[PDB]
Each structure stands twice: as C-alpha cells, then as structure tokens.
Amino acid sequence: HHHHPLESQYQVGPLLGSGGFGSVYSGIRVSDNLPVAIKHVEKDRISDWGELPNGTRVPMEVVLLKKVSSGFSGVIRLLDWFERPDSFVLILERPEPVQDLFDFITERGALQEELARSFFWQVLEAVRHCHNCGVLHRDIKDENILIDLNRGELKLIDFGSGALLKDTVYTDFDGTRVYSPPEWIRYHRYHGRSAAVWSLGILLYDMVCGDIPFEHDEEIIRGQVFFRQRVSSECQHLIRWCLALRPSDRPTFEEIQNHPWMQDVLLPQETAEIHLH
Ligand SMILES: CC(=O)Nc1cccc(Oc2cc([C@@H]3CCCNC3)nc(-c3ccncc3)n2)c1
Hints:
This is Serine/threonine-protein kinase pim-1. One of its GO terms (biological process) is positive regulation of cardioblast proliferation. Belongs to the protein kinase superfamily. CAMK Ser/Thr protein kinase family. PIM subfamily. The active site is at residue 139. By secondary structure, this protein is α+β, with helices and mostly antiparallel strands. The chain has 2 domains: 1-96, Phosphorylase Kinase, domain 1, CATH 3.30.200.20; 97-277, Transferase(Phosphotransferase) domain 1 (Transferase(Phosphotransferase), domain 1). The chain is built from 10 helices and 12 strands. The strands form 4 sheets. It has a 5-stranded antiparallel sheet with strand order 1-2-3-7-6. A 3-stranded antiparallel sheet has the order 8-10-11. A hairpin with a 5-residue loop joins strand 4 (49-51) and strand 5 (57-59). Helix 4 (113-132) runs antiparallel to helix 6 and helix 6 packs antiparallel against helix 8. The longest helix is centred in the middle third of the chain and has 20 residues, at 113-132. The radius of gyration is 19 Å and the shape is globular. The protein binds ligand OWB.
C-alpha cells in the first residue's frame, strides 16, 4: 500500500505535510480558537485558473472550493483565502482529532465491510454534493479523505486537480494515474461522472483489500479484478460494476447507493463508537 492581513487573524502551528498540493500547516483562528489548516500554493505551480462571480483571477481550486463550501457537507470547507506576491493562501476547516484514510488503512489493514460500507456511503454523499454544486473532484482516493475520529465523519480534501462539471468530454487530467480509468489511459478522453465512478471502485477495493487493485497501465486496461482478501460476493459485484471497462456499463450514483451491499449503513456516530473509539 504505497502513496501516489493573514499573519494577524491566524496563529500558525506545525507543518502537516507538503507535495503537489503545496504546504499545509496546522493553525488556529485567533478570534475563536477554531482549528484550521493553512494551505500555501505557489503561483508558478498553478496550471488552472478561474474567476469568482465578482470576477477576480484565482486558482480553480478556490473557485471549486467556494462552489462546494456552502452549507454542511462531507467536503472540507474554505473559510478564507489570501493572495501574496508569489502564492495563494487557503484557510480550511480542520477537524480534531483527524486521520487521512490512507494512514488509517496503513494502521488497520483491510477494513471490515461494515466500516467500509459506512465510509464508502459518506464518500458517495460527498461526491454527489460536489456534482450537485457543479464540481468534479477528479482525484478521489484514500489520501484525499479525512476521518473525524470523534464523529465518524469523512471529509473530501484537495480540489487542486478538479474542474467544473460539464457533459462534454474531458481531454486533460492531472489526478492520480492508478485511480484513472481505462478510457483515459487508452484515449486521453473521459466523461466526468463515469470517471468518478471508476475512481470510487478503486477506492472501495482499497478499503476492503487494504491496497489498490491496479499498479500498471496494462492492468487498468485489462480491468480484471483479483481479490487478495476475503470479500463478500455482494461487495465484489459492486466493485466489478464500478470497474466496468466500458464507461456506460458503470453504475450511476443512484445505482451504487441502491446496490444490496450498500443497504443498512451505520450512522457516522455509531461508526465511531463501534470502529474508531
Ligand atoms: C491538502 C489539503 O487540503 N489538506 C487539508 C485540509 C484540511 C485539513 C487538513 O488537516 C490535516 C491534514 C493532514 C494531512 C495533510 C497532507 C495530506 N494528508 C493529510 N493531517 C492532519 C493531522 C493533524 C494532526 N494529527 C494527525 C493528522 N490534519 C489537511
């Protein structure tokens, strides 16, 4: 299982990590001690720009976060942003305590199906929210999911590879290759929802098997799934449906949520009491 006036209103804490997303720090909003994450993105590493209603030039990541950050959801909310000479600074919600799903799987190995069902359900609700707001994440994977360990609530992070949702073909991609569908590998072409569903099949396999099913382009294109762990027939059926080679053979979000494997989900709080506390 491998990886693939600002200084006034916030007290900066430790660096949490850095990589293609930039540098993320632990912070606290001085006005009310709200835990926050403070994300720095270098201007010359932004390939994707957009504009807000009022029409200032910002990272697409900021456009997409604002579109999804209205109301409650399983998406980490953008509280504020700042422009500096050579960077943007994003202020994000930070649950406490928290663990990314990749780290959680490193520690626990393959998840019990009840727990994978609860997590997968919450991810589907979060992704529906994004699509309903006109946003395609395009990098759904365990590294981009945070677990609120007290509340059993999952949160989607890192909209740095995302785009506005459209009904026409995408011919650009900068998300994670091993979660990218066969139509991307073979043709550099995909549609948003069906590519999202493929990534969800990779994620669900990852949860119940403790690693992703495919490492190489050849395995993605062949689309034969081998189960390395004991997984129920119903769970294998859903995974193999999400991982249909032809995009139009993949389930819709409604078909995933109506699948027999997805019935009788735990509530997040019961999830945390049984599995996390
Ligand atoms: C990219 C983005 O938007 N990040 C984000 C957004 C909001 C909150 C956030 O808070 C985090 C993130 C992580 C890492 C950060 C790097 C990616 N992987 C998860 N770890 C912990 C943590 C703190 C203290 N103890 C354990 C764990 N908190 C990170």
